[model samples]
Target: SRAEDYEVLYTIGTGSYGRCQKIRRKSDGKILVWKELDYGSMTEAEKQMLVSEVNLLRELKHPNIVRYYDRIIDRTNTTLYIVMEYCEGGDLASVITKGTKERQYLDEEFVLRVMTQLTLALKECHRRLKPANVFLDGKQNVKLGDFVGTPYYMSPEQMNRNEKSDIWSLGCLLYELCALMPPFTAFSQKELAGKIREGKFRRIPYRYSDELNEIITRMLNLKDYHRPSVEEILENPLILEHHHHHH
Candidate 1:
């Protein structure tokens, strides 16, 4: 779609790769997130491969997953526009602050809802995310925040983008919900990696269940494959029960 087709609403945010904005289609006033990515240096073949990956992302749809609606490659410039469903709510980070603005913590059941939905979403997704981020609407559901393939692509050393890594990703997602802070973060990547290998963090407060604590610990298991696969997580008695009970 052409930029002329949608009226820009406001700046959304800036991130590692691109500028994001809210936009509304002129014809029907439909809204979407416009992610502007610059791919000028990519070879024609590289660009085509990116298109294929985006095709893979757009093909995915589940209530828990952010929908990637369209991609427009600029004719005159090496820019790419990623258009997707616009969520009108704050994200999990918001979930931590605004949700806890009441001094409330996400209860175990609520955490289970996230576990179940995201597990299902990831099964379909472990079955695909690069940089697949996490976010939420005012509603209870959470989606990986952005609609880009960057997160999953290879780092200079290795991809680490395979399905197993997502287990760690979800571990952090749940960890944040419970602990309200990341398991590991550092000013620089090297320090981040060092702390991750150490796998030590302040304990999740005892108010939350032992199962949640145990699960988070297990998911963050440093042995890579030692962490449960998404399907195995779905089989977890807590999540299994939650999945059936909710349905």
Candidate 2:
């Protein structure tokens, strides 16, 4: 496929790296998300990161993870276009922020449904989990995307990339889903890093159920070794009890 074969509909979101657009195959009108990377402006590190993300997506196949199609290089414009499955419902971050503005948020059951899919996706491998990277499809099913780690969601042991670290991020995401805010907060990124290192954060509010508190607490364990594995999380009472409700 070629870049000219698709039509850019509109910009969906922007990031430090590049802009993502909703594009459609001109031949079939099949929509997909296109991540446009300016090859001329990207540093070596950014270039490698882009390649790594593509490789990761190419290797990953899960019901709850976004699908990767193909990549096109537009030499005329010095841009690389990565075609991916389009999630019409947008990211979880947008959902939470919009809910906050409207004084409405996800209910416990729905939250469980979202978390279950997210956890399953992460179980495929260690993912850099966060609400912004989680998307919802047209069917409103949760799918994990943006396969890279960010400082805000990194675990205490910063360099470690493993299931435990992913669990830590998952905990943060679930907390945000329930409360419309992250568990840890600070005026600066430096302070936020300190808080994550020290595992300093307020407990879940009283409004959420005790079962949720227990699950989140375990996932956020300061000692990475103590955090439950994805297998364990899948079998947790909360997940098992509510799994049937999602579909």
Candidate 3:
């Protein structure tokens, strides 16, 4: 059995929920991710949500998603110690920052590859994701740390569940991949939410040509039910005719 005396070898990340540390079980030195949850700030419902997350993780299987392992809980189940896969590479934010600093955006090939992975993972947790399959890959390709998403990626209809909000998030992902920043980075969550509701989201940044711009423009359109699905976007004539980048 995995013992409780595992030594933390290093710190991985810290978020609003808590800290994640890289540890090695004393018994066999197996590497694992140790997330220490706080009971003081959490309510019973939130604790149950965490448990549900664990259960959902156990049932998940995707290359781009993190792997779940055993968990250690106290008799009260108040304070949890979740064991998970160790993603040594860190999160996608870091990659984006690094790429941005280097002025190297993820080309279309890389973007499509990542999209394939994320879509599959979203399919697995679509329920937890609810209306728009919302999520955040705080970590790199090796692990997807956070599940909830920021408003910038949500479609206008998704933001308000109006008729036109279908592919808003996909457009945001494309923008972030190219620009290294989300569309509403300058606005507060509330402000961004309001913009999405009003169909006033920011336009795509410079660099992409007119046709590429048009495809993304349609996806980001605020009119409910007007946005395209993933299949439609991928099969669009513009993408097929003009996407010249290759691996």
Question: What would the per-residue lDDT of candidate 1 be over residues 86-134, giving only the tens digit for each residue?
Answer: 7676456667775557776778777787778777888876565322265
Question: Could you give candidate 2's per-residue lDDT for residues 1-247 as a string of tens digits?
Answer: 8988999999988876689999999888999988888899878998899789788778787778888888999879988988999988888889889979998867887678787888888776664367788898876578888833336667886533466888888998888888888887777777777778778677666777899888888988899899888888888777754443233
Over 4 Å off in model 3, which ranges?
Answer: 1-5, 26-28, 40-49, 74-78, 127-143, 147-150, 161-167, 185-215, 230-247
Top model by lDDT, which number? Answer: 2
For residue 60, give model 1's deviation from the true position in Å.
Answer: 1.9
Give candidate 2 misplaced runs (Cα > 4 Å): 41-53, 126-128, 147-151, 159-161, 198-200, 241-247
Clashing pairs in 2: none
Better of 1 and 3 by lDDT: 1
Give every collision pair in model 1.
125-128, 130-151, 130-152, 131-151, 131-152, 133-145
Please give the range of 10 consecutive residues that has the lowest summed lDDT in model 2: 238-247
User: Cα RMSD (Å) per model?
Assistant: 4.9, 3.6, 5.9
Candidate 3 clashes: the total is 10
What lDDT score is found at residue 164 in candidate 2? 83
Clash count per candidate: 6, 0, 10
Arrange candidates by lDDT, descending: 2, 1, 3
lDDT of 3 by residue, 114-219 (tens): 4445444544455341212222333324234443555566665444432223356656666676667775553477777776666544555555556556766676
